[PDB]
Amino acid sequence: ASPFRLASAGEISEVQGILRTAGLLGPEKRIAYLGVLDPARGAGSEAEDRRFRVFIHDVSGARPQEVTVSVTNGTVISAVELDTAATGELPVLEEEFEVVEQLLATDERWLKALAARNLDVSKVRVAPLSAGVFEYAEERGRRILRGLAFVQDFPEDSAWAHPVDGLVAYVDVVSKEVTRVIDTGVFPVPAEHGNYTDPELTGPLRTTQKPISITQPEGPSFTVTGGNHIEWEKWSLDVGFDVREGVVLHNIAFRDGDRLRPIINRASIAEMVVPYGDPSPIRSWQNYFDTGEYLVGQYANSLELGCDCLGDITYLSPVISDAFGNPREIRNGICMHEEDWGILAKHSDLWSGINYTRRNRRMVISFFTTIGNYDYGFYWYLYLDGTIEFEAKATGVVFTSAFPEGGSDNISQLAPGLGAPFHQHIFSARLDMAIDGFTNRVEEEDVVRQTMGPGNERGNAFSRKRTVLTRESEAVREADARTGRTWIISNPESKNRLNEPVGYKLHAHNQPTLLADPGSSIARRAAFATKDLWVTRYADDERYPTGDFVNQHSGGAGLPSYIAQDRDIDGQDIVVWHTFGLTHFPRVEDWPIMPVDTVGFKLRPEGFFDRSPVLDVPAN
């Protein structure tokens, strides 16, 4: 019955059928994006209307369409032709990934470049890389991918060990033409292999790890109903999945006594970008919007038990559309489990004689995706004490280049002749807040140092200040770790027993934001990534910090355009957009396969509850 249930195979085939019936999905049409829309505000009173949004590409060169379908009613709600030169190209299609290498393999310029390097064309892999927006006028309105080459010595070889530097090509994937081949000169192709399953490189595998067994003899403490509604240790939520964003959490709420108290209406990673910091023309255009351009949900891994996810795991297997509108299941694509999280609370009191210890646990909801060389784990955590956390785990194989003779200020050395260009991985979490309901506001809280003098004669006092962000023009904020800056989302109309507005405090990691010059293309296309915190007034069409169409799309849409409306956010339905990222100067230890590194944020209750919410946790 829930309007927040996962899309079923049946719903996707029905969208296909409705589109077909309406003349919108003939043999030249391809689905570049398909997802269910969230219910409108206040729609719980009315009956279900499951609506799906679809981006339809045309392989014959016709203009694409954005379409909204009511699968409940079997109707097309709206269909509009897109002018991609204006509003952006559609996301990269799975089927286009092979096309760059295939077209290049019979191009005389490409073949000349490979021959100059004595490389067998049959062994040259070409990465299908998003193009962005630079100085090439002919690309405007065209679907372009750029190709960088990597040699694969044999079918099971890791091509990433053998980058072909000094060479890049641009391809029109619709007209199937190579537009440019740029050869700045030969670099040595690094020769050492990077095969992390080859016994010659690993050596004898360790025999020293004894098993760790994690079981739940009575099963898990969470329940799953209606396919994707979770109840666990007072928490209530619905686990959604979208082909762009991946796992999306809806209706995060906490049962405090008899009352189900909303906290977050929708939580997602609404964008992620990987900007590269190498000024070589071979890579200086490189910025991968994994979410917006590639769609991270689409590439979610099937997660194997006792391997990717350990313990008593409950899986969801979300369904997505293929390019023709047929349903495709991602088997075991979402892991759900609870785990022990050490000590929750502890005190041994001298005066009372009472010794007290309680254990913590967390509910974990995760998926893992692969985008070329990169693999990312997205983890959401709910804790007994009311804390909500997100963590991204970055691994995979580092994107490589040649390491220049005489070194580099923008590339590190991994192996003889092998370089790794500096880059960032920067995420945007979109938190549609609902602290005790939708009437919310945000304050920036700084620590306040005090001067020794009257009222503070010993020079020990310190304090804090809170500044309400009243309108969108004032709600673009930066970190200040030195002053312990955080942001509190409160409900000014809902007070705790001490007559204080209930709230949650966002604790950021205060990692560097986007490093690129403010006049660059990437600073404009990923403007969200230049500041740590944005607050907007909720609107149903303000979904992504980069807008709906990121691929080959200049600035003009996304967060900078949203906040220009300068709307009231002081006790209104608001959305927090938190930028957080990793700045990566690759180390030798990252090669030939990278150990996980992490980044994230959390929110902790701040006068939300009337006392600790975990007094009723039992011993042992």
Q: 558 to 587, contacts with Na ion by CB under 5 A?
A: 573-574
When CB distances are held under 5 to 8 angstroms depending on the partner's kind, the choice from Cu ion, a second copy, Na ion, none that residue 432 binds is: Na ion
Q: Is 156 exposed, middle or buried (0-12, 13-18, 19+ CB in 10 A)?
A: exposed
Does 57 help bind Cu ion (rule: CB under 5 A)?
no
Residues 6+ apart with CB under 8 A from 61: 174, 175
Contact residue for a second copy among 108, 258, 517, 540 (CB under 8 A): 517
Segment contacting Na ion by CB under 5 A, of 164-172, 302-310, 430-438, 582-590: 430-438
Whether 376 has a binding-site annotation, put simply, is: yes
Question: Is residue 270 left, alpha or beta, with left meaning phi > 0 and alpha meaning psi from -120 to 50?
Answer: alpha
Segment contacting Na ion by CB under 5 A, of 105-113, 213-221, 293-301, 432-440: 432-440
Q: Please tell me whether residue 522 adopts helix, strand or coil conformation.
A: helix
Structure tokens at 238: 């619905």
Q: 523 with 530: CB under 8 angstroms?
A: yes
Does 456 help bind a second copy (rule: CB under 8 A)?
yes
Does 429 help bind Na ion (rule: CB under 5 A)?
no
What is the contact mask toward a second copy in residues 159 to 178, using x (rule: CB under 8 A)?
Answer: x-------------------
Segment contacting a second copy by CB under 8 A, of 44-52, 53-61, 460-468, 544-552: 460-468
DSSP-assigned beta bridge partners for residue 392 = 378, 599
Q: Is 374 a catalytic residue?
A: yes
Whether 384 has a binding-site annotation, put simply, is: no
When CB distances are held under 5 to 8 angstroms depending on the partner's kind, the choice from a second copy, Na ion, Cu ion, none that residue 573 binds is: Na ion
What is the contact mask toward a second copy in residues 177 to 196, using x (rule: CB under 8 A)?
Answer: -------------------x
Q: What one-character DSSP code corresponds to residue 396?
A: E
Whether 315 has a binding-site annotation, put simply, is: no
Q: Is 250 exposed, middle or buried (0-12, 13-18, 19+ CB in 10 A)?
A: buried
Does 449 help bind a second copy (rule: CB under 8 A)?
yes
d(CA 446, CA 487): 9
Q: 64 with 85: CB under 8 angstroms?
A: no
Does 553 help bind Cu ion (rule: CB under 5 A)?
no
Question: Is residue 580 left, alpha or beta, with left meaning phi > 0 and alpha meaning psi from -120 to 50?
Answer: beta
Catalytic residue among 33, 170, 374, 383: 374
CB closer to a second copy, 60 vs 154: 154
d(CA 620, CA 207): 34
Q: Which of residues 348-377 bind a second copy (CB under 8 A)?
A: 348-354, 356-357, 359-361, 368, 370, 372-373, 375, 377
Contact residue for Cu ion among 392, 584, 592, 613 (CB under 5 A): 584
Residues 6+ apart with CB under 8 A from 379: 364, 365, 366, 390, 391, 392, 393, 600
Whether 207 has a binding-site annotation, put simply, is: no
- Shortest distance, position 399 Cβ to Cu ion, whole Å: 8
Q: Which of residues 93-112 bind a second copy (CB under 8 A)?
A: 97
Segment contacting a second copy by CB under 8 A, of 12-20, 28-36, 165-173, 516-524: 516-524
Does 593 help bind a second copy (rule: CB under 8 A)?
yes
Does 224 help bind a second copy (rule: CB under 8 A)?
no
Bridge-based pairing state of the strands 246-256 and 259-275: antiparallel
Count of residues that bind a second copy according to CB under 8 A: 152
d(CA 140, CA 142): 6
Whether 589 has a binding-site annotation, put simply, is: no
CB closer to a second copy, 64 vs 377: 377
Distance of CA 285 to the CA centre of its chain: 21
Does 29 help bind Cu ion (rule: CB under 5 A)?
no
For the chain, how many residues are written?
620
d(CA 418, CA 344): 46
CB closer to a second copy, 74 vs 306: 306
When CB distances are held under 5 to 8 angstroms depending on the partner's kind, the choice from a second copy, Cu ion, Na ion, none that residue 5 binds is: none
- Shortest distance, position 330 Cβ to a second copy, whole Å: 13
What is the contact mask toward Na ion in residues 500 to 539, using x (rule: CB under 5 A)?
Answer: --------------------------------------x-
Residues 6+ apart with CB under 8 A from 204: none
Q: Is 165 a catalytic residue?
A: no
Contact residue for a second copy among 308, 389, 474, 570 (CB under 8 A): 308
Structure tokens at 350: 């001298």
CA distances from 341 to 285, 338, 360, 383 (A): 43, 9, 5, 9
When CB distances are held under 5 to 8 angstroms depending on the partner's kind, the choice from Cu ion, Na ion, a second copy, none that residue 584 binds is: Cu ion
Catalytic residue among 38, 242, 290, 573: 290
Q: Which of residues 365-424 bind Cu ion (CB under 5 A)?
A: none
Q: How many CA atoms lie within 13 A of 20 on its CB side?
A: 10
Contact residue for Na ion among 38, 101, 312, 432 (CB under 5 A): 432
CB closer to Na ion, 290 vs 432: 432
Q: Which residue is nearest to Cu ion (CB)?
A: 584
d(CA 129, CA 145): 5
Q: Please tell me whether residue 143 adopts helix, strand or coil conformation.
A: coil
CB closer to a second copy, 389 vs 570: 389
Whether 293 has a binding-site annotation, put simply, is: yes
Contact residue for Na ion among 82, 173, 433, 508 (CB under 5 A): 433
Cβ neighbours of 400 (radius 10 Å): 27
d(CA 494, CA 371): 44
CA distances from 109 to 162, 167, 175, 219 (A): 21, 11, 18, 62
Structure tokens at 386: 């009311």
| Sequence-distant contacts of 56-62: CB under 8 A, at least 24 apart | 56/19, 56/24, 56/25, 56/29, 56/30, 56/31, 56/32, 57/29, 57/30, 57/31, 57/32, 57/90, 57/93, 58/28, 58/29, 58/30, 59/28, 59/29, 59/30, 59/174, 60/28, 61/174, 61/175, 62/28
- Shortest distance, position 569 Cβ to Na ion, whole Å: 10
Contact residue for a second copy among 19, 442, 594, 599 (CB under 8 A): 594
CB closer to Na ion, 382 vs 574: 574
Catalytic positions, please?
A: 290, 374
Name the binding residues. Answer: 288-299, 371-376, 423, 425, 584
Name the binding residues for substrate. Answer: 288-299, 371-376
Interface residues toward Na ion, by CB under 5 A: 432-433, 538, 573-574
Interface residues toward Cu ion, by CB under 5 A: 584
